[PDB]
Amino acid sequence: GSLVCVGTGLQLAGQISVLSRSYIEHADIVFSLLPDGFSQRWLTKLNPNVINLQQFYAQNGEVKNRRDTYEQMVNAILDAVRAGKKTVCALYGHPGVFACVSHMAITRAKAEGFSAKMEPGISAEACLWADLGIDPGNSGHQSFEASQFMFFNHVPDPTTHLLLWQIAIAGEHTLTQFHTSSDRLQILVEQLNQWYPLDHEVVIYEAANLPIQAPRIERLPLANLPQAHLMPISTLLIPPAKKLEYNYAILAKLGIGPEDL
């Protein structure tokens, strides 16, 4: 048995890598977590031996810690590897970006002496730079899970593009609910107001998952975030609020002057 974790990107059918599609095609069995039924149909035509990981999320009125969903997904994948199957995990986007299941399954498979690896995919962030026409390399960029930002002591650099992922469950502490409330979002706005003005323009971004679909690129003042309609697929982009300042201490050591930049 062996494990390869691949990403399908965000857009239906066309955003998977050539090699990643080849892994799915040649797999004994595929474990899938895909955005919608169109993607599921596409995958099933590529390889009919699919197990949908969606089934391990809390269903008909069950209270289930998301950690236990992830553990059951990892166990399901590893059961196929242990049985001797050439196993592929097909996750939407990049399988290792704001996703623990692939990282966990690869670690566990390696510990049990199985061949395992991750193939990079096109993430929601990769789609965001393209759709917004931003070069994040030169500009710099930062990413935090919205809840981790609230529950733990994080400091953003307000001169640099800030992404808050999973904004729709921001401050939901139980990990048993798949939304949050405007009171939790109001507390996040107050937290962000340390560095970002209340009238600071932020962007609710949703990459399109279908080729007939335009992305959501919704500009609004930070203050209005708590009233905004958010989806599980929503990412919040907070552009810089603060002008760059010269690092005089380091420029001096380099022997270069501000005038020169």
């Binding site: 059918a13 066309g14 169109f38 596409w42 007939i212 335009a214």
Partner: protein, 51 residues
């Protein structure tokens, strides 16, 4: 038919460029119903999953 069309449109750059020029003509030529074409042109993703 709708799923087959979206899958081809997603991965076929010739079809995608044709679709950008004349979405309704391309959708008709791929067997979509007027109901499906209306759901697409009004950007109603929930109704598309339905149809």
């Amino acid at each position: 038919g709708l799923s087959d069309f979206f899958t081809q449109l997603g991965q076929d750059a010739q079809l995608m460029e044709d679709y950008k020029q004349n979405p309704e003509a391309v959708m008709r030529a791929h067997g979509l119903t007027d109901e499906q074409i209306n759901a697409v042109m009004t950007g109603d993703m929930e109704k598309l999953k339905t149809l």
